[PDB]
Write a protein that binds this ligand. Structure first.
Ligand SMILES: *[C@@H]1O[C@H](CO)[C@@H](O[C@@H]2O[C@H](CO)[C@@H](O[C@@H]3O[C@H](CO[C@H]4O[C@H](CO)[C@@H](O)[C@H](O)[C@@H]4O)[C@@H](O)[C@H](O[C@H]4O[C@H](CO)[C@@H](O)[C@H](O)[C@@H]4O)[C@@H]3O)[C@H](O)[C@H]2NC(C)=O)[C@H](O)[C@H]1NC(C)=O
Ligand SMILES: *[C@@H]1O[C@H](CO)[C@@H](O[C@@H]2O[C@H](CO)[C@@H](O[C@@H]3O[C@H](CO[C@H]4O[C@H](CO)[C@@H](O)[C@H](O)[C@@H]4O)[C@@H](O)[C@H](O[C@H]4O[C@H](CO)[C@@H](O)[C@H](O)[C@@H]4O)[C@@H]3O)[C@H](O)[C@H]2NC(C)=O)[C@H](O)[C@H]1NC(C)=O
Ligand SMILES: *[C@@H]1O[C@H](CO)[C@@H](O[C@@H]2O[C@H](CO)[C@@H](O[C@@H]3O[C@H](CO[C@H]4O[C@H](CO)[C@@H](O)[C@H](O)[C@@H]4O)[C@@H](O)[C@H](O[C@H]4O[C@H](CO)[C@@H](O)[C@H](O)[C@@H]4O)[C@@H]3O)[C@H](O)[C@H]2NC(C)=O)[C@H](O)[C@H]1NC(C)=O
Ligand SMILES: *[C@@H]1O[C@H](CO)[C@@H](O[C@@H]2O[C@H](CO)[C@@H](O[C@@H]3O[C@H](CO[C@H]4O[C@H](CO)[C@@H](O)[C@H](O)[C@@H]4O)[C@@H](O)[C@H](O[C@H]4O[C@H](CO)[C@@H](O)[C@H](O)[C@@H]4O)[C@@H]3O)[C@H](O)[C@H]2NC(C)=O)[C@H](O)[C@H]1NC(C)=O
Ligand SMILES: *[C@@H]1O[C@H](CO)[C@@H](O[C@@H]2O[C@H](CO)[C@@H](O)[C@H](O)[C@H]2NC(C)=O)[C@H](O)[C@H]1NC(C)=O
Ligand SMILES: *[C@@H]1O[C@H](CO)[C@@H](O[C@@H]2O[C@H](CO)[C@@H](O)[C@H](O)[C@H]2NC(C)=O)[C@H](O)[C@H]1NC(C)=O
Ligand SMILES: *[C@@H]1O[C@H](CO)[C@@H](O[C@@H]2O[C@H](CO)[C@@H](O)[C@H](O)[C@H]2NC(C)=O)[C@H](O)[C@H]1NC(C)=O
Ligand SMILES: *[C@@H]1O[C@H](CO)[C@@H](O[C@@H]2O[C@H](CO)[C@@H](O)[C@H](O)[C@H]2NC(C)=O)[C@H](O)[C@H]1NC(C)=O
Ligand SMILES: [Ca+2]
Ligand SMILES: [Ca+2]
Ligand SMILES: [Ca+2]
Ligand SMILES: [Ca+2]
Lengths: 388, 388, 388, 388
């Protein structure tokens, strides 16, 4: 087996087509299903897998109570084939309250973070064995992508942050060969806060669209040079911004370089990708809540500051339904590299207080060069039907 | 591994022998089992799989309530090895309220349709990745076979319809190579309405026996030329007709060319296949309801208009028990291609109102050149024992 | 992969050592587990599988009620790796209320019988597809081994009976190549009634120890010549007889040739095998009930009429616990062919009337040339703890 | 595939990083999960497996009552991929109330002991078949490691004891080739009592750190010469001793040669390993009870009698939480052999009497040459949330 190089052009797409849905919460009302959050998707050269952070319990289980909390020692990374819900036969790949995973063409890498807030440990597991680890560098919740890392020619990269969630922090970009950390580069450029990067191969390098939790409702960009380990960063140009919270479309701004200081504090994991001067992006439909999900293309959204002409919009989840995190993954076709995305569909607390748990299902779409229609694919569980 | 060509003679059979049964509904009363409908069977060159459309829920689950409806966003295509019931470890292959799947000798193709009635999307997934998609062309429930598609030398064909369920509609035949649509041919010939085709390889081409939902209780035939993409169509000659509803045997007719205008509106998915001048076919035992299931050979049933001499009848499901859709699949043997069929056994609403759900199990038979006896293999669940 | 020839000497053993146990009934009180009976074990060249006839339901399920009955349309053959209990992910291999399975070195053969008592059908499934079938020849419960068939050089043999359970019947020996019946030989020799054969390879032929349900408490022997399809039959010489019911050891007899007319009517499936002049055999400890299970070697038990000197006895299940059917399977080692056996542990009705179901677990032992101790490995469920 | 030789240097480590956690007990409160104890981990050359001794029942099941007992006929060895909890699809590999397993590079060996206390049987299963067996030699609970055995160049070694738990016993070291016992060496050297060895490859031989249940709270060492079958034994030098119970650190002693006669009676399975003159070891945090778990390096802990200078301590489980057995396993990396360990986390009786069962979950760490932080990873179940 050969290392992936992702050395094909990006598929020219017209939008996205339905790919997968797991119905986790509906199933949880009649079956033993893991409580999760922070899901993502990543594929080996043959097939795709769904991942999530378990909460060390199933939903219909008293331990599901107060699973709104992000960090407990019992969180583990779950991995199934895409479309297989997280049932009791699911493998817990590592201990993790924050993670990233990727396949380099030969084997899986998993980056798993657990332990004390002020002194966490990141474990690096490759091809079924622990190869490396690193401890917290800023003593304030060492944390990573919650989506797939990216490997080119046997070197995988992942973005990690340690430090304040509401002020300047310490972001580093790791380069890993067969599970071994071979280089660490500090964040460089104009991005001022980086969380939860959604990265993708853009041969010869890697590009990430992330979350600014401090001053920006525009999404930061991190560019990773795999030849020399140099880092650059900026913000997505589009005046239609991707974070939540954010200003309405008529009063939102981005200058490509600085955080916009528009409802900048807090955020949600998300994604976007460039195509020439244009930008494909997703976001919640609501400007303030993790509600709904839409995708569209922004004409000049990559190259032109404050561009706001969109086209090819698709509703993925209507605004009467809950969404959550979302992220990108890439899939190699015969001639081109395709871009796909998943959307986390969060149910329970804090928004729905009839139940005491917090969990999610997922829906997944992939880029298409063909045509498509309309729809809405929300979680679909009736909150009144659920065990509390 | 090589592409399938199905370039062997059809097996000469004497009837059918028991092959598989999943007991889905009996098991649902003591286990977490998916609610499904529209099942089918398809085999890779080594082994067979059962498929069905899930309803995004298990049976013993409040979400099973009112699952009689055909189209919701939570329907996904399920795929297990044949005989493995749809338990919680079942893979949801794609999002779909209508589907078709087939293996070309190298990899699986799945055709999955979901979304709004008036603006649906068909996704084409091959070897684990989304390769193509197409949107609705008549804005009225784009829909497909609910049984296996057929591939010859790397080109797979599938029949799809969009438009009225009770009048002229727009039927097209797609040719797909490794998930990529390479040609689309409009329906041609004398068939006037086409739904839910049951297709099979008949080298060098593909033949389908379908459902006319408009004016015929005789079943339409669609013939597909894989070399030049030409289409022809007609009706099964047999005066013993295959649809439900239909006239009594003494007053049913077919002229091989036109819908018979005998209780023609509505219908049920079904199958038949030719052997020289004769016809093997299945149908419900009841003339008006989806009750019972029988197979037989009609002497001159392929070539002689209105032929009514049957022989080699077998009861598959007695008329005191519910059936449902049925369809064909083909299995390559050492010297010949065999024909098999499945029967959907529908339980719950609208026929059985003690429970609020609608689901099914399956029974499966394959052609035999040997001998056999008699029996009846219905769903077998006691409606009074079920969770409602 | 090559066809099995079993052309090695039989392992010289000193007794048997513990190999597997599934605890099916204990687990059934806290989990969804199939209701079964008539289990057996058979191994491919790499690993062993457990088989049983399902009753189309799990135990904690209202459909488990009155599963004492031997024949319903919902019985299917289950197949898991040995030691994996029959959970809801278990594959139902075929429809069957009587079966036999075996691997020829290349693929699995399954012989599955279902349908009406007076007109049953036996299906032959090889390498995942239906290859042949045969109908009832005597119109009175066509039936077969309920343990493994045996293949030499690509030809598998299986023994089937059709006709009276309490008088002369019609027993035939089938020879099957890649699922295709190539020859059928009538029973010949002095055995007067044959049921439920436990067969094993004894290169160049196959030897079976069976059950006489009419006049013998001594077990019939069927010898199968694989070169010319000729059949011979007799009775096990040992004066310590293997069937249940039977006379006590002080008043039991066998002359090697005729049924002994000692408590001959009825019986239980069982096994024995020859080693030179000696015989290894198992049987229930009780002479009248399917209670307990013991094995031992009978000195001169193969060659000497009415021999009653035993040695190397082992208790497998003590006589305070229920047993049931038992049968042989053979496993190829580096230098020799080993003999193993399973014991069915039947719980529920008719012996235990607190519950309404009938089911079983299994325990499995293999021949050893080493040493061993003592024990008892019964089903182990507390009948008072079970769902009724 | 080739036999393992473990002919690489030991990885130089700085401590341990989180590797796996199964959350078995939390899950048992909302799912059907096996009752177990005495777990361990062992890896084939590609991936790791978790093993444990089942109690023939799930937790939420009346049969879980009084599962504190160590030996019943229904105990079987369970084997899943590491991180897959023991759900109902788990394979029971053999019948066993004491076990050891290991992979020689080609296939799995399992050593399974069951039967009467005074006359037990050890079965040896290799590559899926029973190859050998041995009976009890001292008629007093024949028993073995409860962790992985070790194979070099096709010979596997395992340590077994038979005899008193509180006085001199009969310990033997077996050498097994492809499941066949080829040599048995008696214990030799100065270790006076040996139980539950935790062994590891130390090319060209094998080294074990065990439990002295008679006179020592210092842990015995057994060294195994694989070339000539000679045995030597002693005690771990470290004055910080590894057993439980044990004296306080200020009053504990070891002289490397003899049991220390300090709270020596009883004990707990545990581990340690040498690196030059230093020692890496784990132990319960509590001196008298199986509570908490810590690891550290003892400077001079291998070579210097009574050394008590520790460094690089890590809390694995805080002392407010239950631990249990622990043991070592080795994983081959690219350049070196790494050492990992598991910790059994025992819940229920006798410590927690609200429930009537006794079971466990596990947590697993592996050696790292990188860095790490702090945490605590206990079982995590709320005893008040459990079925009793
Ligand atoms: C069946 O399904 C298809 C595929 O989903 C639908 O077609 C899509 O429809 C949407 C909505 O109309 C299109 O997305 C929109 O594109 C607009 C730009 O294109 C128009 O205007 C410019 C010039 O001004 C031209 O380039 C172009 O030719 C069009 O005339 C955007 O302006 C839209 O954004 C604005 O409206 C949306 C709400 O719709 C707001 O949320 C935004 O904030 C913004 O104000 C939007 O992006 C999409 O391009 C179409 N796709 C394709 C491939 O054609 C069909 O509509 C659907 N049919 C029905 C009846 O359901
Ligand atoms: C044990 O199992 C076997 C196999 O299933 C059964 O044999 C089958 O029996 C059925 C019913 O008799 C047969 O199917 C029937 O064939 C008839 C035609 O064949 C006869 O008549 C013509 C004369 O021209 C000859 O060609 C031929 O040789 C036969 O003499 C059809 O007329 C039947 O259809 C009519 O009756 C059925 C109800 O039975 C109605 O539903 C139809 O509408 C119609 O009126 C029917 O198709 C079948 O051919 C037999 N199979 C084989 C291979 O022999 C045994 O009967 C069964 N025994 C028992 C007691 O269970
Ligand atoms: C630890 O475990 C081992 C292995 O299981 C036990 O050893 C076995 O013990 C049984 C019972 O004694 C042995 O089986 C018996 O063999 C007898 C024949 O051998 C004896 O007598 C003849 C000469 O007469 C000699 O060949 C031989 O040397 C012996 O002296 C049979 O007579 C027995 O059958 C009779 O008794 C049984 C009940 O035990 C009745 O049920 C029968 O109907 C019959 O009347 C029996 O077959 C067996 O051979 C031993 N195995 C081995 C390998 O030695 C140990 O006993 C056990 N230790 C303890 C204390 O538990
Ligand atoms: C973030 O996480 C890291 C990694 O876990 C923690 O660093 C570890 O901290 C522990 C506790 O301090 C260290 O283990 C201890 O090492 C001591 C010896 O090392 C010091 O002293 C000698 C002087 O001769 C020097 O060799 C050496 O350089 C150090 O100066 C031992 O004495 C300790 O044992 C004693 O204390 C423990 C309780 O802590 C008792 O239980 C023992 O019985 C004994 O009395 C102990 O072994 C460990 O070495 C550190 N690891 C590394 C790699 O640096 C951070 O502390 C943590 N930070 C926070 C705030 O969480
Ligand atoms: C989830 O846990 C919370 C916190 O313990 C539970 O809320 C408490 O429930 C008790 C009843 O035992 C009340 O007396 C307290 O007043 C509650 N505290 C709070 C914060 O409201 C809650 O009941 C649990 N949920 C379930 C379904 O068990
Ligand atoms: C399935 O859903 C239907 C619709 O909600 C339920 O039927 C209703 O039950 C409510 C009481 O809860 C009544 O007020 C209505 O009269 C019913 N509506 C109809 C259409 O009959 C039904 O109870 C549900 N089934 C189950 C098992 O909960
Ligand atoms: C199993 O089925 C039997 C037969 O129906 C049940 O026995 C009957 O139960 C009813 C109660 O509904 C009694 O009125 C009848 O007298 C019973 N008949 C017999 C033969 O005793 C039995 O209850 C069922 N078992 C369970 C647990 O549901
Ligand atoms: C576990 O088993 C024990 C022993 O049978 C049960 O404890 C007994 O309960 C009975 C009543 O059913 C009392 O008569 C005895 O006093 C109890 N015996 C002891 C030793 O305390 C216990 O109830 C069982 N646990 C569960 C959950 O059923
Ligand atoms: Ca923000
Ligand atoms: Ca019709
Ligand atoms: Ca008899
Ligand atoms: Ca001790």
């Amino acid at each position: 087996v050969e290392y992936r190089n992702w050395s094909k052009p990006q598929c020219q797409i017209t939008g996205f087509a339905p790919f997968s849905k797991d119905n986790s919460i509906r199933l949880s009302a009649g079956g033993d299903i893991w409580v999760t959050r922070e899901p993502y998707v990543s594929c080996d050269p043959g097939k795709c897998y769904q991942f999530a952070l378990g909460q060390g319990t199933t939903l219909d289980n008293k331990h599901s109570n107060d699973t709104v909390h992000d960090r407990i020692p019992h969180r583990t990374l779950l991995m199934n084939e895409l479309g297989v819900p997280f049932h009791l036969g699911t493998r817990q790949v590592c201990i993790a309250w924050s993670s990233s995973s990727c396949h380099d063409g030969k084997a899986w890498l998993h980056v798993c973070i657990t332990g004390d807030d002020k002194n966490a440990t990141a474990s690096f597991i490759y091809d079924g064995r622990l190869v490396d680890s690193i401890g917290s560098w800023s003593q304030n919740i060492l944390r990573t992508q919650e989506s797939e890392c990216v490997c080119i020619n046997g070197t995988c990269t992942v973005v990690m942050t340690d430090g304040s969630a509401s002020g300047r922090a310490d972001t580093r970009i790791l380069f890993i060969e067969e599970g071994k950390i071979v280089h660490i580069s500090p964040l460089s450029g104009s991005a001022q806060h980086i969380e939860e990067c959604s990265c993708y191969p853009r041969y010869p390098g890697v590009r990430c669209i992330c979350r600014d939790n401090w001053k920006g409702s525009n999404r930061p960009v991190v560019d990773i040079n795999m030849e020399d380990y140099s880092i650059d960063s900026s913000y997505v140009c589009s005046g239609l911004v991707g974070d939540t919270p954010r200003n309405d479309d008529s009063s939102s701004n981005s200058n490509c370089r600085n955080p916009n200081n528009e409802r900048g504090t807090q955020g949600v994991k998300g994604w976007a990708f460039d195509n020439g001067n244009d930008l494909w992006m997703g976001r919640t439909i609501s400007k303030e809540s993790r509600s709904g999900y839409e995708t569209f293309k922004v004409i000049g959204g990559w190259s032109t500051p404050n561009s706001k002409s969109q086209v090819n919009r698709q509703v993925i989840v209507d605004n009467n339904n809950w969404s959550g995190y979302s992220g990108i993954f890439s899939v190699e076709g015969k001639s081109c590299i395709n871009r796909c995305f998943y959307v986390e569909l969060i149910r329970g607390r804090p928004q729905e207080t009839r139940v005491w748990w917090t969990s999610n299902s997922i829906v997944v779409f992939c880029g298409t060069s063909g045509t498509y229609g309309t729809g809405s694919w929300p979680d679909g569980a009736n909150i009144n039907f659920m065990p509390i």
